[PDB]
A paper describes a structure:
Crystal structures of a natively glycosylated [name]-1 soluble Env trimer derived from the clade A BG505 strain (BG505 SOSIP.664) complexed with the antibody [name], revealed that this CD4bs bNAb exhibits distinct properties from VRC01-class bNAbs. In common with VRC01-class bNAbs, [name] is derived from the VH1–2 immunoglobulin heavy chain (HC) gene segment, and it binds Env with a similar overall pose as other VH1–2–derived CD4bs bNAbs, but it is not as potent or broad as many of the VRC01-class antibodies. However, unlike VRC01-class bNAbs, [name] includes a normal-length (8 residues) CDRL3 (34) and is less mutated with 9.5% HC and 7% light chain (LC) nucleotide mutations to its iGL compared to VRC01 with 30% HC and 19% LC nucleotide mutations. In addition, [name] accommodates the N276gp120 glycan, a roadblock for raising VRC01-class bNAbs, using a relatively easy-to-achieve mechanism involving a short helical CDRL1, and four amino acid changes (including a single mutated glycine) that each require single nucleotide substitutions.
The [name] iGL HC sequence was based on human IGHV1–2*02, IGHD3–22*01 and IGHJ6*02 and contained 22 amino acid changes compared to the HC of [name], all within the V gene. The CDRH3 was unaltered due to uncertainty with respect to D gene alignment and potential P and N nucleotides – the [name] iGL HC sequence maintains one gp120-contacting residue (W100F; Kabat numbering) found in mature [name]. The sequence of the [name] iGL LC was derived from human IGLV2–23*02 and IGLJ2*01 containing 16 amino acid changes compared with mature [name], including 3 SHMs in CDRL3. Of the 3 mutations in CDRL3, two non-contact amino acids (V96, A97; Kabat numbering) at the V-J junction were left as in mature [name]. No currently available germline-targeting CD4bs immunogens bind [name] iGL with detectable affinity, and [name] iGL does not neutralize primary [name]-1 strains. To aid in determining which immunogen residues should be varied to achieve [name] iGL binding, we solved a 2.07 Å crystal structure of [name] iGL Fab, which was nearly identical (root mean square deviation, RMSD, of 0.64 Å for 209 Cα atoms) to the mature [name] Fab structure complexed with BG505 Env trimer.
Residue numbers in the entry:
A (entry chain L): 3 to 9, 11 to 27, 27A, 27B, 27C, 28 to 208
B (entry chain H): 1 to 52, 52A, 53 to 82, 82A, 82B, 82C, 83 to 96, 101 to 226
Write the structure that this text describes.
């Protein structure tokens, strides 16, 4: 029920401000705005309460203020670890959250993917299945292309690939899976997982 | 240390009901209001209501009045949230969260939520529940290293998220990477978990992944050998 931008960005060391607008019945009438920081796959963390107070141990780079019907979260000296979603909140006869702001910190250097390729296990082959597992980590920015080859020819059927997902270090991870029959796996010289990121390519190959 | 520990993930069919628990420790349970907040996957936070663990009085968001009941058992410091007549847009992570200050402070329980449970994913679906197949990923030194090797577990073809994976029953934590799952065209999920270990330990130390898929009531302890 409160209004905040869906996504903002700033550069490292700079300051940034996130706005949270209510009405004169809630934000405009009470000093009961709180702010929350939420990293991927984690619970929210209370950063500000009563418009401008900081819980113990929260970094003094976070401050809060209000004017009229709009509260503001301000982050000074932006750092890479500040990337997260930020929610504002206010009393309103009830607990009312804003829609959330995704904060991106620009200027992060490129990071190249590290790739591990596993062949199908002997156990899986005995169950009459075969899965090749291509695990891709520590890349930035979060865009990758994955391509499979049987010997030298492209393979598109049986391929399943995740969208890049942010890990804790602000770099991204992705997975690709190639499903085959046991007969297919044993009837070729090799299979390859080929990962392309920012124009550079890593290829890992396995064989029976 | 304050700690809120919630019950494990659940899957339900449309029309059923779910009950989530939250066990609190590290503070006087009856002195602080407990809120419940949910988050649909990829969406924002949505307050559901609060209970006063003293007296047991409740207050619910308009959206859920007549579908939700919150209770507590003060003898085991546990709050409960039950949501009935479930629909697919109730699919969400459900959190318990403790109020900032105790109930003697002015303006509790409207100031904020300092301590959060780990969350409980509830999926509302009419699709079939499926448990995982678990396959060992035998060690490989090719990526990684300086004297290390990567091994893992493949968790294939399970339906409702989530799956958790620990190693050596939680005694192994450094170097563990559990990857987000892929949703395959079959409508089933698959993920992998990999840990990097010293190469010299391979012949002498046993590695076991502990796979937990609470929506199907399935646990797999899979040894991963060279």
């Amino acid at each position: 029920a409160l209004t905040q931008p869906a996504s903002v960005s700033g550069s490292p060391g700079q300051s940034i401000t996130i706005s949270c607008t209510g009405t004169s019945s809630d934000v405009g009438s009470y000093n009961l705005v709180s702010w929350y920081q939420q990293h991927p796959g984690k619970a929210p963390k209370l950063m500000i309460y009563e418009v401008s107070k900081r819980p113990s141990g929260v970094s003094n780079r976070f401050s809060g203020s209000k004017s009229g019907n709009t509260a503001s979260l301000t982050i000074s000296g932006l750092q890479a670890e500040d990337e997260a979603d930020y929610y504002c909140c206010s009393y309103a006869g009830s607990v009312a959250f804003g829609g959330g702001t995704k904060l991106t910190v620009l200027g992060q250097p490129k990071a190249a993917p590290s790739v591990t390729l596993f062949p199908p296990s002997s156990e899986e082959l005995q169950a009459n299945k075969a899965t090749l597992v291509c695990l891709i980590s520590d890349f930035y920015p979060g865009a990758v292309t994955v391509a499979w080859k049987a010997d030298s020819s492209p393979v598109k059927a049986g391929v399943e690939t995740t969208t890049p997902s942010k890990q804790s270090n602000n770099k991204y991870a992705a997975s690709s899976y190639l499903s085959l029959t046991p007969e297919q796996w044993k009837s070729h010289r090799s299979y390859s997982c080929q990962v392309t990121h920012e124009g550079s390519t890593v290829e890992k190959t396995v064989a029976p | 240390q304050v700690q809120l520990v919630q019950s494990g993930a659940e899957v339900k069919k449309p029309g059923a009901s779910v009950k989530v628990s939250c066990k609190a420790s590290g503070y006087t349970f009856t002195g602080y209001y407990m809120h419940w907040v949910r988050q649909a996957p990829g969406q924002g936070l949505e307050w559901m209501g609060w209970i006063n663990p003293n007296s047991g009085g409740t207050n619910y968001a308009q959206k859920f009045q007549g579908r939700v009941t919150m209770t507590r058992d003060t003898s085991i410091s546990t709050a409960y949230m039950e949501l009935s007549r479930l629909r697919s847009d109730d699919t969400a992570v459900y959190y318990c969260a403790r109020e900032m200050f105790d109930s003697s402070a002015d303006w509790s329980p409207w100031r904020g939520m300092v301590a959060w449970g780990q969350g409980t994913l509830v999926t509302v679906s009419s699709a079939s529940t499926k448990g995982p197949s678990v396959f060992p990923l035998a060690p490989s030194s090719k990526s990684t290293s300086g004297g290390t090797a990567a091994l893992g577990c493949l968790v294939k073809d399970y339906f409702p998220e989530p799956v958790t994976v620990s190693w050596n029953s939680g005694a192994l934590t450094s170097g563990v990477h559990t990857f987000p799952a892929v949703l395959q065209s079959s409508g089933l999920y698959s993920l992998s978990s990999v840990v990097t270990v010293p190469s010299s330990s391979l012949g002498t130390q046993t590695y076991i992944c502990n796979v937990n898929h609470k929506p199907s009531n399935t646990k797999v302890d899979k040894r991963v050998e060279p």
